[PDB]
Enzyme design. Structure first.
Site, short mmCIF file in Angstrom:
data_model
loop_
_atom_site.label_atom_id
_atom_site.label_comp_id
_atom_site.label_asym_id
_atom_site.label_seq_id
_atom_site.Cartn_x
_atom_site.Cartn_y
_atom_site.Cartn_z
N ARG A 59 86.13 96.47 24.98
CA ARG A 59 85.86 97.90 24.99
C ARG A 59 85.64 97.78 23.69
NH1 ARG A 59 85.71 102.97 24.49
NH2 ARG A 59 86.98 104.13 25.55
N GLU A 108 80.56 109.93 29.41
CA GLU A 108 80.70 108.51 30.65
C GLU A 108 79.51 109.21 31.43
OE1 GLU A 108 80.22 106.12 32.43
OE2 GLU A 108 80.56 105.59 30.01
N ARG A 112 90.49 94.01 29.84
CA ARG A 112 88.99 93.78 29.31
C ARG A 112 89.46 93.88 27.15
NH1 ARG A 112 86.94 99.97 29.86
NH2 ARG A 112 89.39 99.96 28.96
C1 THP Z 1 90.29 101.51 23.56
C2 THP Z 1 91.44 101.31 24.46
C3 THP Z 1 91.72 101.80 26.05
N1 THP Z 1 92.61 101.31 26.49
C4 THP Z 1 92.92 101.91 28.02
C5 THP Z 1 93.71 103.28 27.56
C6 THP Z 1 93.31 104.10 28.93
O1 THP Z 1 93.90 103.41 29.68
P1 THP Z 1 94.33 104.84 31.24
O2 THP Z 1 93.12 104.64 32.58
O3 THP Z 1 95.36 104.09 32.66
O4 THP Z 1 94.47 106.16 31.54
C7 THP Z 1 91.56 103.91 29.80
C8 THP Z 1 90.38 104.54 28.94
O5 THP Z 1 89.18 103.62 28.86
P2 THP Z 1 87.56 103.93 28.78
O6 THP Z 1 87.39 105.23 28.03
O7 THP Z 1 87.42 103.11 29.42
O8 THP Z 1 87.92 104.17 30.31
O9 THP Z 1 91.66 102.31 28.31
C9 THP Z 1 94.09 100.69 26.25
O10 THP Z 1 94.77 100.66 26.35
N2 THP Z 1 93.58 100.33 24.81
C10 THP Z 1 92.75 100.60 23.91
O11 THP Z 1 92.23 100.19 22.88
#
Ligand code: THP
Length: 135
Positions: A29, A37, A81
């Site tokens: 990610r 999205e 990820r």
């Molecule tokens: C980019 C990033 C996302 N995430 C988490 C935040 C969000 O959690 P929740 O799903 O629990 O709210 C999710 C968003 O991902 P996406 O933007 O790929 O959907 O990924 C992290 O934990 N750390 C990060 O640095």
């Protein structure tokens, strides 16, 4: 920070790519970027979702060298990820998207914020120019 080589396995969407990293397939990610999205059991296909996916896909597919650069905090999120800055032939994918108005600087979780200022500079430049998300 240090870049390490990786091999493209498959592009998922605007902010997610599948890479072979130290002989292991992993989902990465992109740090500090939030793209509209395509698929999301949350409101569907946002305007630009498709353009953002397309941009990342072409960029990592036409690259001869892919590099992953972890920040200085946690390197994986709760979904397993990898959290990194990805470079396609020396160019940072995360910045490229922001510069084109196909992503906004989001999810800043310290201390995974080394390039936040660099990206925000790119974002303002794209807003100034009224690109995509900002048109
Ligand atoms: C980019 C990033 C996302 N995430 C988490 C935040 C969000 O959690 P929740 O799903 O629990 O709210 C999710 C968003 O991902 P996406 O933007 O790929 O959907 O990924 C992290 O934990 N750390 C990060 O640095």
């Amino acid at each position: 920070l240090h870049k390490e080589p990786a091999t493209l396995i498959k592009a998922i969407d605007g902010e997610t790519v599948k890479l072979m990293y130290k002989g292991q397939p992993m989902t990465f990610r992109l740090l500090l970027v939030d793209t509209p999205e395509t698929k999301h059991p949350k409101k569907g296909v946002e305007k630009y979702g498709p353009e953002a996916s397309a941009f990342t896909k072409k960029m990592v597919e036409n690259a001869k060298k892919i590099e992953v650069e972890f920040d200085k905090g946690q390197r994986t999120d709760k979904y397993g990820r990898g959290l990194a800055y990805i470079y396609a032939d020396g160019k940072m994918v995360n910045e490229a998207l922001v510069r084109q108005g196909l992503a906004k600087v989001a999810y800043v979780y310290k201390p995974n914020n080394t390039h936040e200022q660099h990206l925000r500079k790119s974002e303002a430049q794209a807003k100034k120019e009224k690109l995509n998300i900002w048109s």
